[PDB]
Design a protein around this ligand. Structure first.
Ligand code: THP
Ligand code: CA
Length: 131
């Protein structure tokens, strides 16, 4: 069975992989699935943040797509794929070499191959975090 998208409104972009959204009428902090800043290098943190911010702010429509596993993490943050006018922020960050694939767990790994495909290209290009 496929996942489903639900509407949400931007409240504020926080950093490369955290955004605060109005979801089902309530403010909620969302952590993007399947991505992280490199473990030992935050050189591209500000660029990643700016990128996410531009993408979500310029969007006419933001959508939340939960996966089949845990919907919130140990902090109560929502765990989702976030779309901006149909473009997956999570995927975009990875194809641009701004964040890498990370935190890959059964149930919450529907888009794992998709993001790994994007990451492979970024890696090949030695782009940003892969330089
Ligand atoms: C992306 C993601 C993060 N997390 C937790 C792991 C990390 O825990 P610890 O904080 O205990 O290291 C933290 C990383 O989030 P940030 O990268 O936003 O700091 O969020 C999950 O549990 N599930 C997920 O899918
Ligand atoms: Ca972050």
């Amino acid at each position: 069975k496929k996942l489903h998208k639900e509407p949400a409104t931007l409240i504020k972009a926080i950093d490369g992989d955290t955004v605060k959204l109005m979801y089902k009428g309530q403010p909620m902090t969302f952590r993007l699935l399947l991505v992280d800043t490199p473990e030992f290098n935050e050189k591209y943190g500000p660029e990643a943040s700016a990128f996410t911010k531009k993408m979500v702010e310029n969007a006419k429509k933001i959508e939340v797509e939960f996966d089949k596993g845990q919907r919130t993490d140990k902090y109560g943050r929502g765990l989702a794929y976030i779309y901006a006018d149909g473009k997956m922020v999570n995927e975009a960050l990875v194809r641009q070499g701004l964040e890498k694939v990370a935190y890959v767990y059964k149930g919450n790994n529907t888009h794992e191959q998709l993001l790994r495909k994007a990451e492979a290209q970024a890696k090949k290009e030695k782009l940003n975090i892969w330089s």
